[PDB]
Amino acid sequence: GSSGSSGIKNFLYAWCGKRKMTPAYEIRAVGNKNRQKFMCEVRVEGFNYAGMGNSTNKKDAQSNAARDFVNYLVRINEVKSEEVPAVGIVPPPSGPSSG
């Protein structure tokens, strides 16, 4: 649908809510004024790490930040990767794109 998706943002929020916590997001604007980009960080109380993301928009930047903090929860074995949803974002091809 035209609103995109929110599965990894909802997964971190639901994981926090099953543990009596709430995730805290933090955002910065970067790049060209007409062709703007955004960076995102996300943190949770009692954890020293911050998951990091970026994109052309705040929603995809939050989804990358959420995926990297949920990945950290697998690096410390507080979450199994088998439960974690796909981020919904893919990189551009490494070849020419000028025409």
Curated annotation (Swiss-Prot):
Disruption phenotype: Mice are viable but have behavioral and neurological abnormalities. They exhibit hypoactivity in novel environments, tremor, and sensorineural hearing loss. Methylated. PRMT1-mediated methylation of undefined Arg residues in the nuclear transport domain (NTD) is required for nuclear import of DHX9. It is found in: Nucleus; Nucleus, Nucleoplasm; Nucleus, Nucleolus; Cytoplasm. Residues 9-13, 57-59 are annotated as: siRNA-binding. It comes from the Eukaryota. Coiled coil: none annotated. Multifunctional ATP-dependent nucleic acid helicase that unwinds DNA and RNA in a 3' to 5' direction and that plays important roles in many processes, such as DNA replication, transcriptional activation, post-transcriptional RNA regulation, mRNA translation and RNA-mediated gene silencing. Requires a 3'-single-stranded tail as entry site for acid nuclei unwinding activities as well as the binding and hydrolyzing of any of the four ribo- or deoxyribo-nucleotide triphosphates (NTPs). Belongs to the DEAD box helicase family. DEAH subfamily. This is ATP-dependent RNA helicase A. The gene is Dhx9.
